[PDB]
Structure 1
Amino acid sequence: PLPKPVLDTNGKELNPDSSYRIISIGRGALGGDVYLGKSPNSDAPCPDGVFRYNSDVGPSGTPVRFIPLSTNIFEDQLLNIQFNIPTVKLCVSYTIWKVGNLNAYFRTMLLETGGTIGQADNSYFKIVKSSKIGYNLLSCPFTSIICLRCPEDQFCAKVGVVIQNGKRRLALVNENPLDVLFQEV
């Protein structure tokens, strides 16, 4: 059993030195790239929400970069995700992806920025092959806590979308994971 690499839209394995737009399998109105947006009800001084657009006919996504434990980006392995964009002095800390506190209204955790690299908190994700088409993102929060009899004592969950203030907000879901591709820039 050897670790499978993750590929971009062009077949080339994923570079930790490269940046990628996270684009959806879905087309037109069922499409829209992942981007960094302002959560309607956040008190953060920076944009701290991970959203996707409502249609793929408009702005492109905010590019990201992946940070493996390793030197290689493989499927089903813990990694960090980080928006790769210039930022005001104030907001330089709000680019690393993480999963937030339990949101009672949505009954799940939402994806936000303000995470940290290489630490056993809420900032670890995985890339895996989707059951339908393409790739899924997984969130594995609480790597510091033993999940009893779970795969490698580890709580993991699929990443999807909820609608928050009429925008597509990425969040942990049970069904309809966001099927995505990675388009190098």
Structure 2
Amino acid sequence: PLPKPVLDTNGKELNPNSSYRIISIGRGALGGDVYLGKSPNSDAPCPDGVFRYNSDVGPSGTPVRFIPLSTNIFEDQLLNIQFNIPTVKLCVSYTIWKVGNLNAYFRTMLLETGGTIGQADNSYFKIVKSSKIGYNLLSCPFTSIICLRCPEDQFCAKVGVVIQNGKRRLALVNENPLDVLFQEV
């Protein structure tokens, strides 16, 4: 059963050598690209939160790029995500996607930057097919820990949104995964 590659909004497969906006299936109010923001309650000296805009009628998202364990970007395979933007050089670290510590208010972990590439921690995601339209992101935190009788001894979860100060904040959810598309820039 051959690994299936993830495609952009043009059919053309996903390339490590290129940058993409993670854009929303949902249209208008129901849409808004993923971007890099500052968490309302973060002590980080850089923007460290992963949000989507509240409508698609405003700014484009922040270009991300993907980093497989492989050579190519496939469905259902661990990878790193990283905002692909020039930074002031305190924040030079705060571009790699990561899943945070458990947040008691939201009872889930939230997406943030400050992650690492190549390492077995909280910085691994999966692209997969939505059960509805397009693609879902997964977060597979704790790759170093045997998740008992789980697929491949690995804990993974769907990536959705919670509302944090009236902004859409990507977080691990149980229902309504964010369905997304990748759009080269």
Q: Deviations over 1:66-117 (max 9, x none)?
A: 0000110000000000000000011100000000000000000000000000
RMSD over equivalenced CA pairs, Å: 0.2
Structure 1 residues 126-141: aligned runs within 5 Å: 126-141=126-141
1:4 CA drift (Å): 0.2
TM-score after normalising by structure 1: 1.00
Q: What SS does the corresponding residue of 1:50 show, helix, strand or coil?
A: strand
Runs of 4+ displaced beyond 6 Å: none
**Partner residue, 1:152:** 152
**Partner residue, 1:15:** 15
**Partner residue, 2:181:** 181
Q: Deviations over 1:28-67 (max 9, x none)?
A: 0000000000000000000000000000000000000000
Q: Percent identity?
A: 99
1:121 CA drift (Å): 0.1
CA distance in 1, matches of 2:107, 2:93: 27
CA distance in 1, matches of 2:114, 2:12: 29
Q: What SS does the corresponding residue of 1:169 show, helix, strand or coil?
A: strand
Alignment gaps of 5+ in structure 2: none
1:23 CA drift (Å): 0.1
CA distance in 2, matches of 1:153, 1:52: 31
CA distance in 2, matches of 1:165, 1:66: 28
1:155 CA drift (Å): 0.1
1:179 CA drift (Å): 0.3
Q: What SS does the corresponding residue of 1:109 show, helix, strand or coil?
A: strand
Q: What SS does the corresponding residue of 1:29 show, helix, strand or coil?
A: helix
CA distance in 2, matches of 1:182, 1:26: 13
Residue 29 in structure 1 maps to residue 26 in structure 2: no
Alignment gaps of 5+ in structure 1: none
TM-score after normalising by structure 2: 1.00
CA distance in 2, matches of 1:38, 1:80: 20
Q: Deviations over 1:118-139 (max 9, x none)?
A: 0000000000000000000000
Q: Deviations over 1:7-40 (max 9, x none)?
A: 0000000000000000000000000000000000
1:175 CA drift (Å): 0.2
**Partner residue, 1:64:** 64
CA distance in 2, matches of 1:141, 1:24: 24
CA distance in 2, matches of 1:106, 1:145: 24
Q: What SS does the corresponding residue of 1:10 show, helix, strand or coil?
A: coil
CA distance in 2, matches of 1:91, 1:74: 29
Aligned length: 185
